[PDB]
Design a protein around this ligand. Structure first.
Ligand SMILES: Nc1ncnc2c1ncn2[C@@H]1O[C@H](COP(=O)(O)OP(=O)(O)O)[C@@H](O)[C@H]1O
Ligand SMILES: Nc1ncnc2c1ncn2[C@@H]1O[C@H](COP(=O)(O)OP(=O)(O)O)[C@@H](O)[C@H]1O
Ligand SMILES: Nc1ncnc2c1ncn2[C@@H]1O[C@H](COP(=O)(O)OP(=O)(O)O)[C@@H](O)[C@H]1O
Ligand SMILES: [Mg+2]
Ligand SMILES: [Mg+2]
Ligand SMILES: [Mg+2]
Lengths: 124, 380, 173, 371, 411
């Protein structure tokens, strides 16, 4: 008894238009414009993450160099925050390609880019 | 020192450690264990050219213990062998340490509360009939820690080596009918730690081993803050298993024993002491005091002595006092508990707050009349 | 437990850390000679068979350092008697062991420098060595009557099996 | 059938049949639980022990008293003691025997309401009553006027009664009794080094107290005498043949009845509490109360307590009049005897609470009938 | 009908097997396992590895003690399982070959030493509940079974629920005070000496003197000497004198047969008659980490118990287990306690000043006839009672709580 009690207590139309135009490099940059990391809601996060994934899986594997090196370092770190989000929702195809995007963003951003995923107080 | 040039020594003769220095000092000179030992031959340990005297005392006896039978001259605050205590005092005032000409000194002793009568009588005797001190006093553990804290009101929770005492004092008035003794203290936690290390397959049995397991305790043991989460941590993960190196170089692994052993202070039945733990025994002391004094006692819980130094004891003791108060006084008004004001005074210097208190008192009263028992007033 | 030196009277001279008990003996040497039959060497000889098994031994009397020295030396004497083949041949040998030099307290080879403090007086050295040599002389000659079985003069099966059991794992050599 | 009498003492339960002269059951009001979890099987037979088996086995048992300061504190254990009384000590089915219980004055009202509920709903007695312990003492003394000092295991109380009328405003209560005298004895023996502490070992100090304690007729003269001669020292053999020794501690123990300051009470002593209650009655009554002090209850058995009380009151009261302390030898059982008398009288049989009344009035009935 | 429960007492020296209700065990077997010799394999850096069905090629008990081509491993040490690979195989053949019990239909009573580290209870529960799939299990405590085995054989008046159990097996010795049928487990003391330690002391003490005993059967001869020529002596220094002065009475001849060839050999049996048993009273002979005689640990155990139980414990000291039945064992222990306890009372009487001369304490040591198997018998009596089937951990509990269910034991 005497010690029982608890006490002392993204623009989907812009992305679609870029993909349907085939402007793949801009389609990535279009997705990375305005991340809802500032925003409290969950649905807008899963929305934004799904829109980013739509680009990554529709990217051709050989072009990931031209994709990732186009981004600025603040973009490359944001790409990493979206990559580690994709792995939380496996599928037949998604993990096989996200693991490749990871290794090219790793060359661009380095291990320090991953620390700014672990340490960020905001979920993208 | 005194105006007459008389040195004013202050001297705690604990069952664990002698702590003996001059009045007005902020630190004790010369901490050493209250130990006596005698040379023996063991067939299993190396002998060398280190000279072992026919009797050794104190610090030297504790470090050469590997070739000594060793004895603690005092237990539970009671002198067991007056001959070994004479030797320990002879070392204390001796050339090894306080090299005082005792016949010219004033000495402040202390005595535990509610101690046996003839113990004090024979202590006061030897000070005038063998050391010939120029003046004596026998201070009380409770008031001394209050001088070291500068307070006039509080409940002292003096947890030494041999025994633990709770002593209320209110505005300088004593409340001796509220004194409570708890038989668990640091010597029994060490006996208990031995009994647990035996269950992991180690062995500790010789007199020299008792001091080694004491140092294991002081290094590794801690009071769990929330015993359920400590047990969960030990079962879920290996992180508590921490190594130690015996003087023989044998490595031992210490695990959940680190918190099981101190826990006897809060669940006395674990060492077959019948009663209630220090937190509840303290609470039952406050609730016995006159009704309006209670709200001051909760604001001045004062800890003292080395067996309080376990990491987390103040934090744990706060938690239980709050749970006791919510259970028994507020009847579950968990919102109203937020108004409960409780302070556990946990100065890091508290390991020596008794001696520090005596050095304050003797410096305040070095030259006054009615304080010191003089050898002129003795022998009548 | 162990067996501890029983014969120390309320007074008897202590040399270094070691009590100059009597020794009922025919040889020369400083110690008293008269009114004895039970004796410090006989206690060592009577206890030895038990006293070597105890693994822990507490020094509490200067006369223990006397008895310990005999109990150590008996484990040197048996090392000779074991190889002999007659009481006469051992007894003759034991004279030469008794004369043989052994280290004194505080020497770099003495086994128990931690417990025997070194002497310093010239008369203390001579009295001590004269006593220790007298102890050795009798201790050997006592065993020669006891180790050799009279039925065949050969060193006895029983006493000789203790040769591997040095007292307290301390050699005297 | 014949009524049972069941004095639910704080210390000893005293029980029997109405009309008998002495209780057919006396046993200690303790409930014991095993200290050690390690039962075997068959043996280790019960979760808890009650009464005399809990004294006998006590070394393995933590003992608790269901009554403290005369108020029932653990009803589950108190029910266990009542169940033990009827089914084991008396071997009586209580559903057909009226049972007279007892209580101390100035208790909480909720105490006796809960008490009467259990009798009618668990033991389903036909009838019962709840008399005040002090009033019962005059029945055993065979008189109708006097001041009763009853001091038990848990409470000391005074009820003055004149010509068969109680004077409820002069009733006084003091929570010193045989419990606190034992804890004080258990304290003062630390001056010798005789630690006890264990609740089992408190029962040994209790026996030490009963067999060696006495009240000094002049406390300060006896204290100065104990400083001079060994004559007061009496040894006692503990169950393991350790022989303790006790000196001035023999009478310092009961002295705290007269100097409650020894254990930090602010109250006046039992003599002055008695005197203050007489000085609270009307002038014409006082003349009779001084003549008829009746002592009752266990702690009044201390040797010399009659003489000390008589000495002390005669120093406070006006000197022109006789003060006499009535103290029969059976004063330990006075309350049970007085119950057995009351339950036997023909004039009493009309005033039983009965099941048919409880069924309509509910537990509050006890506040209406038993006055 | 309803099948009787199984009782298995996996001692360090011997394992006792049988079913509840029988007066004695159906098998007593040596606690060892013989596994196929394999040193010819290229074990160049690691322990042997198992293939195929070869791991079933083992024997246990008397089939295992002297096989010509199998290595006799001894998997129990100090009472604790040291290798569960060997123990799980040992249990496999105990259940299916010796007991003939199908384990999925019988409740099992197992036993443990009070030193048993909790992980061993978790492991033993895993093996019984998952490998053998028992319906229910109970890890009983050896001391209360020993006292019950005494109690149930006691005549009226001696039949009592309080007594100091001293269990001295092959591996370790325990002093365990029981009062009112509750084990006062916090007062338990352990003495690190047992039949193994006595045997090795004789084994050394022969090899120092009696070279001629074939090493392949040195252990057999030390064990046989201990079991038949040894006794607890009154004191050493008089016994050595007794042997030296009258050796024709005290020295005995033991004659052994060499298992290789069949030649005789013979040895003089001497000081190892009373040395050996002495190590109970002087553990420093065989263990340097211990020094209290058994007749002192007993008094320390009792003098920690509550003062009201303290006398009943001296009145009913029960010896149990194989190592206690040396001749004159109890006669010496009693003589020591009735010295130690009397000296205590005399001191307190003197300090009382001759007033209240205390009533004595009659130390008594009792030694019933079942001691080779008393723990098993107490188990077989318990396992016949209806209440046994309530206190067992039922399989449906383990399938909810997991092995943690067996974490606790009566401290
Ligand atoms: N760092 C520590 N943490 C916990 N316990 C300690 C620590 N240091 C010492 N102790 C314990 O506190 C005691 C040290 O002696 P001390 O506190 O001076 O007691 P006393 O003053 O009564 O002799 C010993 O019992 C020792 O085991
Ligand atoms: N011979 C005696 N002398 C002094 N006190 C006694 C004696 N016998 C019993 N007592 C005290 O009497 C108390 C019990 O009082 P009693 O009236 O019998 O119980 P209750 O008050 O509960 O009815 C016990 O606490 C015991 O200490
Ligand atoms: N008559 C005897 N005298 C002395 N020791 C014996 C005797 N008989 C057997 N022993 C020893 O007792 C040891 C322990 O036996 P037991 O208690 O059955 O083993 P465990 O403790 O494994 O159950 C045996 O290994 C044996 O060495
Ligand atoms: Mg202290
Ligand atoms: Mg009463
Ligand atoms: Mg066994």
């Amino acid at each position: 008894r005497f010690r029982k009690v608890d006490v002392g207590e993204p623009d989907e139309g812009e992305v679609d238009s870029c993909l349907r135009q085939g402007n793949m490099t801009a389609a990535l940059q279009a997705a990375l414009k305005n991340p809802p990391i500032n925003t409290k809601s969950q649905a807008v996060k899963d929305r934004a993450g799904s829109i980013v994934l739509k680009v990554l899986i529709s990217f051709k594997a050989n072009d990931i160099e031209k994709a990732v090196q186009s981004l600025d370092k603040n973009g490359v770190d944001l790409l990493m925050k979206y990559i580690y989000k994709g792995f939380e929702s496996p599928s037949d195809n998604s993990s096989a390609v996200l693991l490749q995007w990871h290794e090219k963003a790793l060359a661009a951003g380095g291990v320090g880019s991953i620390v700014r995923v672990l340490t960020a107080r905001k979920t993208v | 020192m005194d105006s007459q040039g008389r040195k004013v020594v202050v001297c705690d003769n604990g069952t664990g450690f002698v702590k003996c220095g001059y009045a007005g000092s902020n630190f004790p000179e010369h901490i050493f264990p209250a130990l006596v030992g005698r040379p023996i031959i063991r067939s299993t340990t190396k002998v060398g050219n280190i000279e072992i005297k026919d009797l050794m005392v104190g610090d030297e006896a504790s470090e050469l213990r590997s070739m000594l039978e060793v004895n603690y001259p005092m237990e539970n605050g009671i002198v067991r062998n007056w001959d070994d205590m004479k030797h320990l005092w002879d070392y204390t005032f001796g050339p090894e340490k306080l090299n005082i000409d005792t016949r010219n000194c004033k000495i402040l002793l202390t005595e535990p509360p509610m101690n046996p009568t003839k113990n004090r009588e024979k202590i006061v005797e030897v000070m005038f009939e063998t050391y010939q001190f120029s003046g004596v006093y026998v201070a009380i553990q409770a008031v001394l820690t209050l001088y070291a804290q500068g307070l006039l009101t509080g409940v002292v929770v003096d947890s030494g080596d041999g025994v633990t005492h709770i002593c209320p004092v209110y505005e300088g008035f004593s409340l001796p009918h509220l004194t409570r003794r708890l038989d668990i203290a640091g010597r029994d936690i060490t006996r208990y730690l031995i009994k647990l290390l035996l269950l992991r397959g180690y062995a500790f049995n010789h007199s020299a081993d008792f001091e080694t397991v004491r140092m294991i305790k002081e290094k590794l043991c801690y009071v769990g803050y929330n015993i359920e989460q400590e047990q969960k941590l030990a079962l879920e993960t290996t992180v508590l298993v921490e190594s130690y190196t015996l003087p023989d170089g044998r490595i031992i692994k210490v695990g959940g024993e680190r918190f099981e052993a101190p826990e006897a202070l809060f669940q006395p039945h674990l060492i077959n002491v019948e009663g209630v733990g220090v937190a509840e025994l303290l609470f039952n002391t406050i609730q016995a005091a006159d009704i309006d004094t209670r709200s001051e006692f909760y604001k001045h819980i004062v800890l003292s002595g080395g067996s309080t130094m376990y990491p987390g004891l103040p934090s744990r003791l706060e938690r239980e006092l709050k749970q006791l108060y919510l259970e028994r006084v507020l009847k579950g008004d968990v919102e109203k508990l937020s108004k409960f004001k409780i302070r556990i005074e946990d100065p890091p210097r508290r390991k020596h707050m008794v001696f520090l208190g005596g050095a304050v008192l003797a410096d305040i009263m070095k030259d006054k009349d009615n304080f010191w028992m003089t050898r002129q007033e003795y022998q009548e | 437990p162990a067996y501890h030196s029983s014969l120390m009277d309320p007074d008897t001279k202590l040399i270094g850390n070691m009590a100059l008990l009597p020794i009922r003996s025919q040889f020369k040497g400083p110690a008293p000679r008269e009114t004895k039959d039970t004796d410090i060497v006989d206690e060592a000889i009577y206890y030895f068979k038990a006293n070597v098994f105890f693994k822990n031994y507490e020094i509490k009397n200067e006369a223990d350092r006397t008895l310990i020295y005999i109990t150590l030396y008996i484990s040197e004497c048996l090392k000779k008697l074991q190889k002999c083949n007659s009481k006469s041949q051992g007894e003759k040998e034991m004279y030469t062991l008794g004369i043989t030099n052994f280290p004194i307290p505080g020497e770099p080879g003495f086994p128990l420098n931690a417990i025997y403090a070194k002497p310093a007086n010239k008369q203390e050295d001579e009295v001590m060595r004269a006593y220790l040599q007298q102890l050795r002389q009798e201790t050997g000659l006592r065993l020669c009557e006891k180790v050799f079985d009279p039925q065949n003069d050969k060193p006895s099966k029983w006493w000789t099996c203790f040769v591997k059991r040095q007292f307290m794992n301390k050699s005297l050599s | 059938t014949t009524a049972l009498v069941c004095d639910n003492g704080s210390g000893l339960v005293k029980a029997g049949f109405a009309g008998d002269d002495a209780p057919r059951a006396v046993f200690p009001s303790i409930v014991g639980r095993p200290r050690h979890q390690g039962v075997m099987v068959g043996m280790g037979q019960k979760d808890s022990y009650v009464g005399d088996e809990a004294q006998s086995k006590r070394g393995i048992l933590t003992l608790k008293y269901p009554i403290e300061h005369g108020i029932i504190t653990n009803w589950d254990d108190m029910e266990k003691i009542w169940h033990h009384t009827f089914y084991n000590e008396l071997r009586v089915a209580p559903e057909e025997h009226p049972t007279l219980l007892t209580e101390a004055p100035l208790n909480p009202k909720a105490n006796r309401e809960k008490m009467t509920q259990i009798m009618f709903e668990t033991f389903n007695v036909p009838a019962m009553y709840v008399a005040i312990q002090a009033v019962l003492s005059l029945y055993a003394s065979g008189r109708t006027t006097g001041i009763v000092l009853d001091s038990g295991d848990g409470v000391t109380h005074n009820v003055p009664i004149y010509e068969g009328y109680a004077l409820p405003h002069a009733i006084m209560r003091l929570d010193l009794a045989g419990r606190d005298l034992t804890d004080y004895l258990m304290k003062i023996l630390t001056e010798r080094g005789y630690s006890f502490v264990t609740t089992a070992e408190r029962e040994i100090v209790r026996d030490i107290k009963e067999k060696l304690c006495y009240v000094a007729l002049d406390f300060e003269n006896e204290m100065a005498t104990a400083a001079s001669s060994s004559s007061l020292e009496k040894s006692y053999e503990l169950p393991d043949g350790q022989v303790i020794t006790i000196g001035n501690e023999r009478f310092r123990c009961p002295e705290t009845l007269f100097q409650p300051s020894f254990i930090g009470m602010e109250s006046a002593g039992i003599h002055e509490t008695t005197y203050n209650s007489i000085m609270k009655c009307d002038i014409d009554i006082r003349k009779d109360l001084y003549a008829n002090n009746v002592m009752s209850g266990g702690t009044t058995m201390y040797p010399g307590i009659a003489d000390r009380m008589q000495k002390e009151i005669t120093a406070l009261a006006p000197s022109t009049m006789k003060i006499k302390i009535i103290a029969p030898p059976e004063r330990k059982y006075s309350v049970w005897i007085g119950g057995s008398i009351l339950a036997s009288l023909s004039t009493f049989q009309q005033m039983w609470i009965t099941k048919q009344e409880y069924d309509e009035a509910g537990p509050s009935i006890v506040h209406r009938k038993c006055f | 009908g309803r099948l009787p429960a199984c009782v298995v007492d996996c001692g360090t020296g011997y394992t006792k097997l049988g079913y509840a209700g029988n007066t004695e065990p159906q098998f007593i077997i040596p606690s060892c396992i013989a596994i196929k010799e394999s040193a010819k394999v290229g074990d160049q850096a690691q322990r042997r590895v198992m293939k195929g069905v070869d791991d079933l090629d083992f024997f246990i008990g008397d089939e295992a003690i002297e096989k010509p081509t199998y290595a006799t491993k001894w998997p129990i040490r100090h009472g604790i399982v040291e290798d569960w690979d060997l123990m799980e195989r040992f249990m496999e053949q105990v259940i299916f070959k010796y007991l003939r019990a199908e384990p999925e239909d019988h409740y099992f009573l197992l036993t443990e030493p009070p030193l048993n580290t909790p992980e061993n209870r978790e492991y033993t529960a895993e093996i019984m509940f998952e490998s053998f799939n028992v319906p229910g299990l109970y890890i009983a405590v050896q001391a209360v079974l020993a006292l019950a085995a005494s109690w149930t054989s006691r005549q009226v008046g001696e039949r009592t629920l309080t007594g100091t159990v001293i269990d001295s097996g092959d591996g370790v010795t325990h002093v365990i005070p029981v009062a009112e049928g509750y084990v006062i487990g916090s007062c338990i003391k352990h003495i690190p000496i047992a039949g193994r330690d006595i045997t090795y002391f004789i084994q050394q003490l022969l090899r120092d003197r009696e070279v001629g005993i074939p090493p392949e059967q040195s252990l057999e001869t030390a064990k046989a000497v201990k079991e038949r020529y040894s006794y607890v002596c009154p004191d050493l220094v008089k016994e050595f004198n007794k042997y030296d002065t009258d050796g024709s009475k005290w020295i005995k001849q033991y004659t052994g047969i060499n298992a290789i060839s069949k030649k005789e050999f013979s040895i003089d049996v001497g000081y190892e008659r009373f040395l050996g048993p002495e190590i109970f009273f002087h553990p420093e002979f065989a263990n340097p980490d211990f020094t209290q005689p058994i007749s002192e640990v007993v008094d320390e155990v009792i003098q920690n118990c509550p003062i009201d139980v303290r006398r009943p414990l001296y009145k009913n000291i029960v010896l149990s287990g194989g190592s206690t039945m040396f001749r004159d064992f109890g006669r010496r222990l009693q003589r020591d306690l009735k010295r130690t306890v009397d000296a205590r009372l005399k001191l307190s009487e003197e300090l009382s000043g001759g007033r209240l001369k205390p009533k004595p304490i009659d130390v008594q040591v009792i030694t019933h006839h079942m001691q080779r198997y008393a723990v098993w018998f107490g188990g077989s009596m318990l396992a016949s009672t209806p209440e046994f089937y309530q206190v067992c951990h039922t399989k449906k509990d383990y399938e909810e709580i997991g092995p943690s269910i067996c974490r606790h034991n009566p401290v």
